[PDB]
Design a protein around this ligand. Structure first.
Ligand SMILES: N#Cc1cccc([C@@H](NCC2CC2)c2ccc(F)c(NC(=O)c3cc(C(F)(F)F)nn3-c3cccc(CN)c3)c2)c1
Length: 229
């Protein structure tokens, strides 16, 4: 997150860290807890995939530095990458993770509701600048959506589809960045947070007139419901 501030304990209880344990353990992506056994993330977060075991999913956490062996984590039972996801294109950037064991809901660990907006927040432990590093304390930033027309105007080299939503400022300075991928874009509807986007990509981070591009969750609701039951 570029241009954001430190989150507080319990503030974003659906935010998870998707980490890989090889020799060292590292955070690769965010995700959003959407049910007791279900995490929603970006398909591109699995572009290294075939490496067997080695995924640990952390929920109810604020600070990556306070992860020890004592820190509980979830394990992956199943990954469902959208059928139309292609590594070479940037389309359909969405995946579900079935956890091996259900997580309980608490004030620290609970799901974002699923189903045009200024009051939107992007969160994660990604870079706070393009030549950046993974952040310790979960960052938050308030960013308005832009129309698809406006976003497409900014990205002549790419196809911005009806299944994408964009968020950014004309003069940049606030954006998601590398390592935020797969985490939430939430917006306030009628006193309640809804998952509007999944952090996907952009031309760098926080550049003027280069907004963040998100997977538009509303356009995948049939696929999310079908795959989860
Ligand atoms: N349609 C389409 C399409 C076609 C080809 C490539 C891409 C896209 N990569 C594959 C998509 C996700 C599956 C793409 C295109 C152009 C780009 F410049 C990038 N780059 C990034 O994204 C990117 C680079 C960096 C960093 F600077 F840190 F290295 N961070 N980031 C990033 C990471 C997260 C958020 C955002 C939103 N500021 C940015 C990514 C998209």
């Amino acid at each position: 997150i570029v241009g954001g501030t430190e989150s507080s304990w319990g503030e974003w209880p659906w935010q998870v860290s998707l980490q890989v344990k090889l020799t060292a353990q590292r955070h690769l992506c965010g995700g959003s807890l959407i049910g007791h056994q279900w995490v929603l993330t970006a398909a591109h977060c699995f572009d290294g995939l075939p490496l067997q075991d080695v995924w640990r999913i952390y929920s109810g956490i604020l600070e990556l530095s306070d992860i020890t062996k004592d820190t509980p984590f979830s394990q992956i039972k199943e990954i469902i990458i959208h059928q139309n996801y292609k590594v070479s294109e940037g389309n359909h950037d969405i995946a579900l993770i079935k956890l091996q064991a259900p997580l309980e809901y608490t004030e620290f660990q609970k799901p974002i509701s699923l189903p045009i907006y200024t009051n939107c927040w992007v969160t994660g432990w990604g870079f706070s600048k393009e030549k950046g590093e993974i952040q310790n304390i979960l960052q938050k930033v308030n960013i308005p959506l832009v129309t698809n027309e406006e976003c497409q105007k900014r990205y002549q080299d790419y196809k911005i589809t009806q299944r994408m939503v964009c968020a950014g400022y004309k003069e940049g300075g606030k954006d998601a960045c590398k390592g935020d991928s797969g985490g939430p874009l939430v917006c306030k509807h009628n006193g309640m947070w809804r998952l509007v986007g999944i952090t996907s990509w952009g031309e760098g981070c926080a550049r003027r007139e280069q907004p963040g591009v998100y997977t538009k969750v509303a356009e995948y609701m049939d696929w999310i419901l079908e795959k989860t039951q």
